[PDB]
Structure formats: structure tokens, C-alpha cells
């Protein structure tokens, strides 16, 4: 019914924000927002979806957004998007638990190195 569609928004907005299902939604967003003809998402489109999806959840979204504009003028691969949410979940305010020799992409570690002095 139309009333069911109207009432759908509160409940599944409440339910989607829970962990687990939100992981599946975040994974599906990459394929949904990507044209079939290219494996890499465009920079502007990726920034727009980062603003739209990770609003408030990411502690340093405003700082992370200003990056990869004057330095990384290339498309974003699929692996960085997958690990960005885990990096945001594991990160702390002091950023002292990060490791440069771990399983993180070359973009996350360079961003951490760039943002370390300013805090």
C-alpha cells in the first residue's frame, strides 16, 4: 500500500544503520554507483558518495575529503573503498595505533602520514 511505502522509511532507516547489514549496503553502493564500463569510480562521484553515505559516522570525514584533491588526481580502486570503513571503525583520536607495515593500501598510510603532524 501507499501507506506502507510511506512508513517504510523510518523503520528501514533505523534497521540499516545497524552493523552487518550496513556492511552489505556499503559493499553494494560501489557496484550501484559505478558504470558497467569502468572498474574505477570517478573522483568527484566518489567524493559525493563519501559525503552522502558516511555523514557523521566518520570522525575525520571533513579532513579526509580535502585530501586526494591536490595530490591524488586519479580514480579510486575497489580495495580502498572496502577497507575505508574498517579503518574508520578501528581508528582513534590520537591515531597512535596505526601501523605502516600492515595490510592497508598505499593511500590510507600516506593520508595518515600527512594528517599526523597537524594533530
Amino acid at each position: 500500500s501507499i501507506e506502507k511505502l510511506k512508513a517504510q522509511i523510518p523503520k528501514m532507516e533505523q534497521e540499516l544503520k545497524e552493523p552487518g547489514r550496513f556492511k552489505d549496503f556499503y559493499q553494494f553502493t560501489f557496484n550501484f554507483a559505478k558504470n558497467p564500463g569502468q572498474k574505477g569510480l570517478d573522483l568527484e562521484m566518489a567524493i559525493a558518495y563519501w559525503n552522502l553515505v558516511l555523514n557523521g559516522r566518520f570522525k575525520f570525514l571533513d579532513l579526509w575529503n580535502k585530501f586526494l584533491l591536490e595530490h591524488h588526481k586519479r580514480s579510486i580502486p575497489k580495495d580502498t573503498w572496502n577497507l575505508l570503513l574498517d579503518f574508520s571503525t578501528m581508528i582513534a583520536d590520537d591515531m597512535s595505533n596505526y601501523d605502516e607495515e600492515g595490510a592497508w593500501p598505499v593511500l590510507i598510510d600516506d593520508f595518515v602520514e600527512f594528517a599526523r603532524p597537524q594533530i
Partner: protein, 467 residues
Amino acid sequence: KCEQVLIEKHLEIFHTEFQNLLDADKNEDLGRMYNLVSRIQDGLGELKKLLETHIHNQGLAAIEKCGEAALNDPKMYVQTVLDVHKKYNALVMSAFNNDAGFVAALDKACGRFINNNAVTKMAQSSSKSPELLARYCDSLLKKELEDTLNQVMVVFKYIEDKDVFQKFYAKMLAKRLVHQNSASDDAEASMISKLKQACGFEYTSKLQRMFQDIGVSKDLNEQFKKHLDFSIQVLSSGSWPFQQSCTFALPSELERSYQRFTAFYASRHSGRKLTWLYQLSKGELVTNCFKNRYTLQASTFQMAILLQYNTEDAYTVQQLTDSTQIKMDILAQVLQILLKSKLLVDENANVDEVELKPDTKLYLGYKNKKLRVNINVPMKTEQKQEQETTHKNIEEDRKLLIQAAIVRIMKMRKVLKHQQLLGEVLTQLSSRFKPRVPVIKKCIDILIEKEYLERVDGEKDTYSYLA
């Protein structure tokens, strides 16, 4: 008891003397010291570390003494390293009775001060030493001497970056094989055997392929001269580091040979053609209109430019460009080379400093003491660009080898952690070079992007292989 009273109670004083005995060469005093201290149990460690520190400091001082000159003079650097190395080797053999600890300390110190030095800091890279060693080897080989080769070989094992040296030596050997200026084939064979003992079989097999190509070219040339002064060398493109030439217009006088040989190849081999190279091609020309008969050795570009003056008089740079079809940089370099020798010259001191723009000329004097004249000289800035290109190729090849090593590792083991792949990669390539983790890490993301490795969902730190 006595050894405790006489030697143990004054060991500190002995140490204070040791450095002094290192400042002034006294082999007998050092030998007596070693003999007396050898009685004391685990008393040689301080002497070993002091000797290592002294050797490192002396080597650093010796390298820094000849600064600003060894960058473009490899021979001075090799001699400075070799004299110090032989002096300390003789000292260890004589005074210290060739002890294992002393030779180990000497090797550690040599490896420390050879890779890193003032020259390395000036060059901002650690690959300068293998390049200098390769340059010295090429200078020695190109046109009683095996001792220097053995010294170079025994020094080379201390180099932690052998790929650069191998690539530079292969390139210089190819250049020395293309142009027939070699001191002796026996020296080349001895060097090949020494590298076979030192390096792997594949690196020497590449050079064996080069020699086989040279022999095939010689046989083809003799067959051509039997069938018929023109000499040509045919080499495979996939086994030599040369690059394709730019656009160039064949001189008319040289066209006659070009049509004759090519068809011959079409008669012998079907399905292949020839891509001629002009930067590595040289020749001789004879002029009889001077005061005395003259013969000049030139290159293809220089010969073409000169043969453009036959039947005309003064030319200007726009013409030499649209007729001969030579790029602006190469044409400018060739014109500068021709100028600095007074053959084409409004009378300007700064021929070296000149700015050449399209405006201008043969000078008919040209006296010289010698009847025959070599005007073919290396370009001003070709060597630096060639070195940079070789270095870039080395880094790209390093990345490719790491990407292939990870792939070949991830086929014996279906699943692997991140701290067990890196150690395997490091220990597998440790013979040639020691890659950095970000270099090894940047290759993993490339492989994952190309659908070669997959991160399992449950663990982000454990890769797997997919078909």
C-alpha cells in the same frame, strides 16, 4: 694467576694503547698485543669492535678526501677502496693470524662503508657505486691485468644492489660488441667465467646470446661479401637494449648499398624485415679539395649533414631540418659538435655557450697535423639522460620481478598471511636486491586490482589465490 696479574689488571690501558697502535702502523706491536690478549678469555671482542670502528672511520675519511671528483671519476673511487681493502686484509692476515672474528668484522665494516659514503650522499642514491664499478670495468676492458679484475670481483660481493651493476655491464658489453674496439677476447672470456662463478647462469646466457648474434652477423657479412666497402651487423631486437631510431632521410650516395642488401635478406629469410639504426652507425669519408688530402671518421647524421654541402654553399638551420629530417635537439647537438671543431662556422667566443636559432658556411682552411681525423665524439648530455633512463628501467624491472615473485609464491600456498609473504619475497630476492616494504605493498594492490589475489571476508590480513 700470572696472566690475571700481568694482563687482566691493565686491560683498560691496553685498550687505550690499541687505538694509538691503529693511528701509526706498527704490525709487530699489534701482533704482540694479539698474542698476549689471546690468553685472556673472551678478551678479543673490544679489540674487534675497535678495529671495525677504525676501519669504518678511515674508509669514510679516505672517500671524503677525494670528494667532488669521484662522482665522474670511477677509477679514483675504485683505487681508494682497493688500497684500503688490501691494506686491512694484509694487516688481518699478518698481525691477527687470519682470525674468523677479525675477517668478519672487516667484511662488516667494508659492507658498511662501501654502500654508504659521501659520494652516495651527493648522488642521493645507493646505486652510484655499482655504476662506477661497471664504468671502471668497461674502461679497463675497452681499448698483468687479471689481478685488478680479481680485486674488482672480490670487492663486488660487498655490493647490496647487484642488478644495477649487471644491467650496466650488459649495456656496456653490448656497446663494446657493436663497435669493434676491444682490447682482447681473452679478457672478455675471463670476465665471463668470473661472472659465471659470481652471478647466475641466465645472466651469462644473455651475453652468450649476444655473442651468438655477433657470430651470426659475421657469418652473414662474409656470405654477403662472397655473394657480391659496405659492412653491416644484424642483431635481434629482443636480446639487445637498443631502442628504435627516429625519423631520418637516407643520403642519396648511400642509397645504392641500402637497396642491394635488403633484398638479399628477403632472399634468405622470409617473414622478417630490418629496422635500421642510425645513431649507432658510423663511417668514413674522404675530401680532396682541401690543401691536403683528408679523411674523416663521422656518424650517419654528421655524414648526411656534410653530404648536404656537396653541391650548395651556405645553409641555414631551417633548411638542414626540413631536408635531412633531424629533430631539433639532436640537430642542435650535432651542429654544436661540428662547430667546436672549426669545420662549419659571426666569429663568436661562446661556441660552447651559443644559442642556436634558425639563422646562420663552410670554412675552407682547416689545417691539421694528422692526415686522418676522428670528429665523432659523445654528446654533451647524452650520458646523463641514458643513466636516468637505465635507472628508471631498473626500478620498473624491480617492480615487475616483485609482482611475478608474489604471484609464483601464491601458487604453492593457496592462502597466506601478510607477514609470511613479505619474508618469503625478501629472502627470495635477497641475492639481487633488498626491496622496501612500500614497494612490496604497492605491488599487492596492483595484483588485487588485476584479479590475482583476494582478501578473504573474515580476515583482511590473509590473501588467497583465485583462478
